[PDB]
Amino acid sequence: AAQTNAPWGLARISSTSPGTSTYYYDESAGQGSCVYVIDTGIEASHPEFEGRAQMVKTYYYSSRDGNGHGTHCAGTVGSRTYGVAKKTQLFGVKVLDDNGSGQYSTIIAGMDFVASDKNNRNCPKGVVASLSLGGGYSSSVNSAAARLQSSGVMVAVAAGNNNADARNYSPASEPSVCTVGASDRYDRRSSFSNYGSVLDIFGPGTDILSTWIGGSTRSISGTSMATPHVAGLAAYLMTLGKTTAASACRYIADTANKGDLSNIPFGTVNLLAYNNYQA
């Protein structure tokens, strides 16, 4: 399938070259997979989600996304126009308040929630969790992400926006999850993207158009935007049967575009997420 005039990041993940604007992908499109977006919520009524999004948990007075961040990330995972995996099921877990903040204890509870809640959902092709959040190093946050991964969920986490080594941030520094850095439309490391040995992969993160609250759209930047590209890619590849939750991060790294990014520091992988779809 071909989506013309797609956001640059979608075109990038199906291309061996920057500078194109059509997204190519197998029509299965993540059907039968599920992606949990652990964030500020999801505006499930947005027409771009086509009824495939729902809120499953909140730790606050509402499950509504009063911020936009979670709706944007969910849109990159799976919206009809802005999403990688256009037929996946999206489940929102609101661990972040409407200012975008959340206590680590609530974030941990949300991760353990997903590990159990997947047993209440129909995801025959597999389960992914996208975590566009983080703070300073915490062994307990890392351990919660490790448990979620161990339970059979492909966990993708943002590397962070500190232009620093991700070793000092959590859950970015957890070895067993997929830590995602950000790139721009010219295949440069995004100026804010963290780096370091713990990164597994880069995805599009600068000037990413997606859904926003109020039935709207907007373009924003961050490793929070790169993470859902990778989460959606994992769901898409799992639906195709090319990988599993336990090995999807390594498979994405194996099949990535290699050595094409600039300003990647010595000791950080030079790998850009790529679906290897051949029309």
From Swiss-Prot:
Alphabetical UniProt keywords: Calcium, Disulfide bond, Hydrolase, Metal-binding, Protease, Serine protease, Signal, Zymogen
Domain of life: Eukaryota
GO cellular component terms given for this protein: extracellular region
Cofactor(s) needed by this chain: Ca(2+)
Active site: 39, 69, 224
Reaction(s) the record says it catalyses: Hydrolysis of keratin, and of other proteins with subtilisin-like specificity. Hydrolyzes peptide amides
Enzyme Commission number: 3.4.21.64
Function (record text): Hydrolyzes keratin at aromatic and hydrophobic residues.
Family of the protein in this entry: Belongs to the peptidase S8 family.
Protein name per its UniProtKB record: Proteinase K
Organism listed in the record: Parengyodontium album (Tritirachium album)
Range of the intact protein held here: 106 to 384 of 384
